[PDB]
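new request in #modeling-help
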Amino acid sequence: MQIFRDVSKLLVERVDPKILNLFRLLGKFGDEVNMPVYVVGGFVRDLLLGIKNLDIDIVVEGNALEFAEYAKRFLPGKLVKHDKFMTASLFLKGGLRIDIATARLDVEMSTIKKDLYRRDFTINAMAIKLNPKDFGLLIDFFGGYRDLKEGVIRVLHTLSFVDDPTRILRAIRFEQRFDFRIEETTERLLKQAVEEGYLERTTGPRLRQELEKILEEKNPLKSIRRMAQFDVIKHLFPKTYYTPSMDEKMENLFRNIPWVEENFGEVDRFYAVLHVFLEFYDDESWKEVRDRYSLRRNLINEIRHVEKSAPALLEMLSERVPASFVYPLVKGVSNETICHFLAYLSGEKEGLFKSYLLKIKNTKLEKINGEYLIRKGITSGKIIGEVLEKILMKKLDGDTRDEEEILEEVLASLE
Amino acid sequence: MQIFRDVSKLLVERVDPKILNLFRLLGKFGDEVNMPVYVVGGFVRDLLLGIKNLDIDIVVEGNALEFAEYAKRFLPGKLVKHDKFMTASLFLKGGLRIDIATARLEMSTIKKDLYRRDFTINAMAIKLNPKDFGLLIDFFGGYRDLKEGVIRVLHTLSFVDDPTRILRAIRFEQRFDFRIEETTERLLKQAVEEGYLERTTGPRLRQELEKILEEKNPLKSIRRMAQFDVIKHLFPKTYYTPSMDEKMENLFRNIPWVEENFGEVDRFYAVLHVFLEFYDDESWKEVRDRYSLRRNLINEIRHVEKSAPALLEMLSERVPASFVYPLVKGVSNETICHFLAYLSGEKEGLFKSYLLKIKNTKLEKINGEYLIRKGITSGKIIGEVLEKILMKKLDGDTRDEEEILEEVLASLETEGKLAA
Ligand SMILES: Nc1ncnc2c1ncn2[C@@H]1O[C@H](COP(=O)(O)OP(=O)(O)OP(=O)(O)O)[C@@H](O)[C@H]1O
Ligand SMILES: Nc1ncnc2c1ncn2[C@@H]1O[C@H](COP(=O)(O)OP(=O)(O)OP(=O)(O)O)[C@@H](O)[C@H]1O
């Protein structure tokens, strides 16, 4: 196919001038220090799709470090060097990070081709040359341009997933972000690497990251679902079986995470999802998952809390009951515990349980009473904190005045 | 002779990064709109000389306006377009703006554009398009002349074409401590004698002249101008004699001092004070009209040439302060210098101390006006009696009210009512 294309006009019309100007300069600096300068990866992809990107990757043929020190000279910002693998990032204003790398060991200067070929999918393996001579040059050896037109996710070569099974995850994320489809050959390859154990063959940490990145997408459920279609989940969490049920939970989970965030703050989605994936895990199967990925040791208790009390919750919800009855179930629990509870309901029940949650957040108001009256009268320890709890509940449902309710339960519990 | 050299290394080393990046961007734009882009004029001269320069003077082979318009898409600022004659200006901050013009009518049409300029060292260019980014272009041998410090017109008619360049050539001579190579010297004299300055408008000459007086040695520029007999051809009745000269010397040694105690000094006028001395009624008319001088300047100037002798015998015999006041009472700072133009040594240290006395011994402390108005009195006598007190103060004093009474008293030679 056409391998070279002029996207210079495309550049000036779609690229904000502060940024287009930075390209013209990087290109000239490249020429001044005698190195080919390319912008590569995601920006090239998004540019052709009309998507904005402010995370731009430069590849030079030469020395990133040199090239980047030479650039700092003429550009305002902070330079971070990473010597071990000649690489660098220049930090510019307005969320704008410019990363520079050195391409390793087809006119000739086509060593970018060896750089491009090492990448994951064709839409992500294209390059735009920035040196003034060839300023707008779209370099596309692998048919990523057409693959953008035809909405196709495609690996560069047969051994792609075997080299990095982490791309199994990447393929699905991108195919779900853009509504593309993983082409036949890649799908056979993807399926095969999953089936054979390639994921189980890759480190927890890299899997976790690729997982988190999915959870930072617009619609993670899409990807989780697609994963389930490719048996990927079974192989990440060996005791998790993604059934109509789990998936119904996952949908509720995702529906309610906003509403939670809005009222309780940051939700760590990786933990929120694990609450679902991991329900009903035996003790042993839990340690292995908790060790493969690094999972806060108390998690399995928190999950076990939700999976144990869920029918009771459901039950209380039907039969609308006194808020004080559900309090013990949401006591001092993570936003993920709350999310996990919400995973279990929809419609009327859902909102109903919402209102309880609010009633609990907001009505923690013990107000006038402040623990003084308690150790003013005689008290020690645990009793202090049990009278304080009985006062608390009485409020949630109705109310008394200041402390009739206090002497109500020191003389009701006195019995 | 070598025309092309590569000053790109010198560019990154000497030019400010904001500006360099401008230069690179500008070159890059030209390539995008198919126009050769050069930086020209004095920036090139100054770069080469290590002298700071912010002027961004640009010439393109294509169309200043289309170019300037294209550049504006990517550069924040006001675009003024000098639509007649195809020039533009791109306005940016820091005191910074880009002047873009069209290389008038091989890429080496810049040669024709470089050929119209004044002197070799101002006739160069640096190309900016990325393929030739730091490329010096010296068809006319401005590098050689820059290094040898030589002022040399580009061709034979240069002075006939623009007599302004005669004053320019001197100005530069003295700014860079350069000298005017002989053929340009011979060629200038010729242009001056044949009467070419007078053939070209007053403003144009006036501007070049004010410009000369802002430079490093105005004195030097003037004695030099005198050598080529240009003064005589600018102000027909000014004859640069050693009298005329020694006045000018003092003028300039004193301006610093004047400017110190009194304030800004207009050098152009401060010079004309000396040039225009002794111009008859009919001659002042012509000069004043041509260079757009103040109707009144002649008066101020005549004032000094007349009252000048009197001042000397006032300093020999250090007569009390009062006796000189009438002579410097409302006059301009230029007038003050004009007077100072006559004094050397101990005559000036004395005359200087007098001026300083009157400056801040105005000192009308409590006897201000309507005090005297509360006795009888009405206009123009008020002013006279007030003055006579202040005047007595210049040379010692009393209460400030005892003196007014000694003076109304002295009044009775006559005023108009009262006075036991
Ligand atoms: N695991 C991988 N295998 C092969 N190539 C990769 C891999 N990760 C990244 N790349 C290459 O690095 C480029 C940038 O990495 P990055 O994760 O930022 O990709 P991206 O396209 O920006 O994805 P995102 O938009 O999710 O940030 C990609 O466009 C791709 O060429
Ligand atoms: N009177 C003139 N005749 C011919 N060419 C001129 C004349 N004045 C200027 N030029 C050309 O245009 C350029 C810009 O004019 P300008 O007076 O700003 O020069 P400059 O070198 O910047 O000197 P200055 O220090 O006075 O700014 C000159 O350097 C010269 O190349």
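bot summary: Chain B touches chain A at residues 8, 12, 17, 20-21, 24-25, 28, 31-32, 73-74, 130-131, 133 (CB under 8 Å).
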